């Protein structure tokens, strides 16, 4: 499940670590964690782990560091927002909701 999600595509992409190192603060979040780094490495080894960790707040916040909110949302996605302005993302294509912004890199192999 979720093997074609933007988050799995990004985390398991050949160039994930290049994109990570190019974002210094994201690099700090990854490098200095224990649990987040462990979860990212588990997903990279076995992508089934992403669905298992999909709503984990630290994983969501980390992947959202890479979101480019200047881009259009991809076809079929909708943003909804909290009274507190927290955004969530509905992929009406797969009828699934996530806190992770689909406008993250490394989506196409």
And the tokens for 76? 């079929």
- For the chain, give every domain's residue range: 6-98
Q: C-alpha distances in angstroms, 105 versus 8, 83, 98?
A: 11, 28, 17
Resolution (A): 1.8
* CA distance linking residue 7 with residue 98, whole number of Å: 10
Q: Which long-range contacts (CB under 8 A, 24 or more apart) does 70-75 make?
A: 71/103, 73/102, 73/103, 74/6, 74/102, 74/103
The Cα–Cα gap between 35 and 22 comes to 21
At 42, phi and psi to the nearest 5?
-65, -40
> Structure solved using which method?
X-ray
Whose tokens are 């480019």? That residue is 68
d(CA 82, CA 88): 8
Cα 30 from Cα 21, distance rounded (Å): 10
Pair 43, 35: CB distance under 8 Å: no
7 closest CA partner among 28, 21, 18, 52: 52
């Amino acid at each position: 499940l979720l093997l074609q999600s933007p988050a799995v595509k990004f985390i398991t992409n050949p160039e994930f670590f290049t994109v990570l190192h190019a974002n210094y603060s994201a690099y700090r979040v990854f490098t200095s964690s224990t649990c987040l780094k462990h979860m990212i490495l588990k997903v990279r080894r076995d992508a089934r782990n992403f669905e298992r960790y999909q709503h984990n707040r630290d994983l969501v916040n980390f992947i959202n560091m890479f979101a480019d909110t200047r881009l259009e949302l991809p076809r079929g996605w909708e943003i909804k927002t909290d009274q507190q302005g927290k955004s969530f993302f509905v992929d009406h294509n797969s009828r699934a909701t996530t806190f992770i912004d689909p406008r993250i890199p490394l989506q196409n192999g």
